[PDB]
Design an enzyme around this catalytic site. Structure first.
Site, PDB file in Angstrom:
ATOM      1  N   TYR A  47       0.798  -1.207   0.000  1.00  0.00           N
ATOM      2  CA  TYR A  47       0.000   0.000   0.000  1.00  0.00           C
ATOM      3  C   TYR A  47       0.830   1.255   0.000  1.00  0.00           C
ATOM      4  O   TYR A  47       1.996   1.265   0.443  1.00  0.00           O
ATOM      5  CB  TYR A  47      -0.972   0.049   1.233  1.00  0.00           C
ATOM      6  CG  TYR A  47      -0.253   0.252   2.521  1.00  0.00           C
ATOM      7  CD1 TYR A  47       0.262  -0.840   3.217  1.00  0.00           C
ATOM      8  CD2 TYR A  47      -0.012   1.534   3.032  1.00  0.00           C
ATOM      9  CE1 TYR A  47       0.931  -0.662   4.423  1.00  0.00           C
ATOM     10  CE2 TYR A  47       0.722   1.724   4.229  1.00  0.00           C
ATOM     11  CZ  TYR A  47       1.159   0.613   4.918  1.00  0.00           C
ATOM     12  OH  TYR A  47       1.862   0.734   6.079  1.00  0.00           O
ATOM     13  N   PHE A  80       2.048   9.822   3.343  1.00  0.00           N
ATOM     14  CA  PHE A  80       2.367   9.650   4.761  1.00  0.00           C
ATOM     15  C   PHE A  80       2.970   8.276   5.066  1.00  0.00           C
ATOM     16  O   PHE A  80       3.618   8.126   6.093  1.00  0.00           O
ATOM     17  CB  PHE A  80       1.192   9.954   5.679  1.00  0.00           C
ATOM     18  CG  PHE A  80      -0.036   9.108   5.442  1.00  0.00           C
ATOM     19  CD1 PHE A  80      -0.132   7.820   5.951  1.00  0.00           C
ATOM     20  CD2 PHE A  80      -1.123   9.628   4.754  1.00  0.00           C
ATOM     21  CE1 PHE A  80      -1.277   7.062   5.738  1.00  0.00           C
ATOM     22  CE2 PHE A  80      -2.273   8.869   4.554  1.00  0.00           C
ATOM     23  CZ  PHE A  80      -2.344   7.581   5.047  1.00  0.00           C
ATOM     24  N   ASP A  81       2.758   7.279   4.200  1.00  0.00           N
ATOM     25  CA  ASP A  81       3.378   5.953   4.399  1.00  0.00           C
ATOM     26  C   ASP A  81       3.237   5.077   3.150  1.00  0.00           C
ATOM     27  O   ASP A  81       2.311   5.234   2.368  1.00  0.00           O
ATOM     28  CB  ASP A  81       2.700   5.194   5.548  1.00  0.00           C
ATOM     29  CG  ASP A  81       3.551   3.995   6.066  1.00  0.00           C
ATOM     30  OD1 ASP A  81       4.786   4.063   5.995  1.00  0.00           O
ATOM     31  OD2 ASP A  81       2.983   3.002   6.575  1.00  0.00           O
ATOM     32  N   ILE A 119      -7.685   0.447  10.398  1.00  0.00           N
ATOM     33  CA  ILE A 119      -8.791   1.353  10.340  1.00  0.00           C
ATOM     34  C   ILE A 119     -10.003   0.736   9.596  1.00  0.00           C
ATOM     35  O   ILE A 119      -9.863  -0.090   8.653  1.00  0.00           O
ATOM     36  CB  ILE A 119      -8.386   2.714   9.726  1.00  0.00           C
ATOM     37  CG1 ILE A 119      -7.849   2.542   8.285  1.00  0.00           C
ATOM     38  CG2 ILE A 119      -7.435   3.458  10.665  1.00  0.00           C
ATOM     39  CD1 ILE A 119      -7.536   3.899   7.645  1.00  0.00           C
ATOM     40  N   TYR A 133      -8.960   7.917  11.170  1.00  0.00           N
ATOM     41  CA  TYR A 133      -8.443   8.290  12.518  1.00  0.00           C
ATOM     42  C   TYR A 133      -9.268   9.354  13.209  1.00  0.00           C
ATOM     43  O   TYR A 133      -8.894   9.869  14.263  1.00  0.00           O
ATOM     44  CB  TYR A 133      -6.979   8.687  12.431  1.00  0.00           C
ATOM     45  CG  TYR A 133      -6.091   7.548  12.027  1.00  0.00           C
ATOM     46  CD1 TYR A 133      -5.748   6.537  12.952  1.00  0.00           C
ATOM     47  CD2 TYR A 133      -5.606   7.433  10.747  1.00  0.00           C
ATOM     48  CE1 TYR A 133      -4.922   5.472  12.599  1.00  0.00           C
ATOM     49  CE2 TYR A 133      -4.774   6.345  10.384  1.00  0.00           C
ATOM     50  CZ  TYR A 133      -4.443   5.390  11.310  1.00  0.00           C
ATOM     51  OH  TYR A 133      -3.659   4.333  10.935  1.00  0.00           O
ATOM     52  N   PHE A 153      -5.720   5.674  -0.123  1.00  0.00           N
ATOM     53  CA  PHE A 153      -4.747   4.591  -0.214  1.00  0.00           C
ATOM     54  C   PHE A 153      -4.870   3.906  -1.554  1.00  0.00           C
ATOM     55  O   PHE A 153      -5.980   3.764  -2.081  1.00  0.00           O
ATOM     56  CB  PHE A 153      -5.007   3.487   0.855  1.00  0.00           C
ATOM     57  CG  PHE A 153      -4.694   3.863   2.267  1.00  0.00           C
ATOM     58  CD1 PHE A 153      -3.465   3.529   2.867  1.00  0.00           C
ATOM     59  CD2 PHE A 153      -5.654   4.508   3.048  1.00  0.00           C
ATOM     60  CE1 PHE A 153      -3.196   3.825   4.177  1.00  0.00           C
ATOM     61  CE2 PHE A 153      -5.369   4.819   4.350  1.00  0.00           C
ATOM     62  CZ  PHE A 153      -4.172   4.475   4.932  1.00  0.00           C
TER      63      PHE A 153
END
Ligand SMILES: COc1cc(CCCOC(=O)[C@@H]2CCCCN2S(=O)(=O)Cc2ccccc2)cc(OC)c1OC
Ligand SMILES: [Ca+2]
Length: 191
Positions: A111, A121-122, A141, A167, A184
């Site tokens: 991902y 962010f990741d 999540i 979140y 994502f």
């Protein structure tokens, strides 16, 4: 005026380009794609609703300073963005061919996650490390627990996750703010 400024937006990222009026737009298109880590041919660039061809110059298209170019992901077949009753959105970028991910199964994915302004962010790929989780198990999540269901192995799905499925008001990790919508791209590797 020999040069002009052009904004390219993909609906998330906004990048400005200063280019000579007689330079082919190829240079801008390739510079934009390079940043988003993609090949120029994986994207479609539109000016005034008309697809830009890489040999065309700003002069050819009568472009003016601060004109805007829209960048869209090439999706030949044409795609569909699905909105479920929870408010989750998803879009299959590539359909899988393999087994179907079902609630209760342990699945493995790659991902990447971004904020809606385009900030990454990741990514599992940054660590060359597939991520496994129990689908429906409440360890990720909620947008993931819902959104990965029904994927088939080999599939790439783009999730747009509203904050109540992410979140929420508290955000995460010093990076994801309160009330953030998350994007994502998830590739299903195994079930
Ligand atoms: C801080 O709050 C929570 C933290 C976790 C830990 C797992 C977090 O990871 C994820 O769920 C998602 C989807 C699966 C891959 C990892 N992501 S992630 O968003 O990329 C995690 C992340 C990385 C870097 C900065 C911030 C956040 C689970 C949660 O739900 C069970 C949380 O509550 C909403
Ligand atoms: Ca791993």
């Amino acid at each position: 005026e020999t040069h002009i400024n052009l904004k390219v937006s993909d609906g998330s990222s906004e990048i400005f380009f200063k280019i000579k009026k007689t330079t082919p737009l190829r240079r801008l298109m390739e510079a934009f794609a390079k940043r988003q880590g993609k090949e120029m041919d994986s994207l479609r660039f539109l000016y005034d609703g008309i697809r830009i061809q890489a040999d065309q110059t700003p002069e050819d298209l009568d472009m003016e300073d601060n004109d805007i170019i829209e960048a869209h992901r090439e999706q030949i077949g044409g795609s569909t963005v699905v909105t479920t009753e929870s408010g989750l959105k998803y879009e299959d970028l590539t359909e899988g061919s393999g087994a179907e991910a079902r609630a209760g199964q342990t699945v493995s994915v790659h991902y990447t996650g971004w904020l809606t302004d385009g900030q990454k962010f990741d990514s599992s790929k940054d660590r060359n490390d597939p991520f496994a989780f129990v689908l429906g198990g409440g360890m990720v999540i909620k947008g993931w627990d819902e959104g990965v269901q029904g994927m088939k192995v080999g599939g790439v799905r783009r999730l747009t996750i509203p904050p109540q499925l992410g979140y929420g008001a508290r955000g995460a990790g010093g990076v994801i703010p309160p009330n953030a919508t998350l994007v994502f791209e998830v590739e299903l590797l195994d079930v």
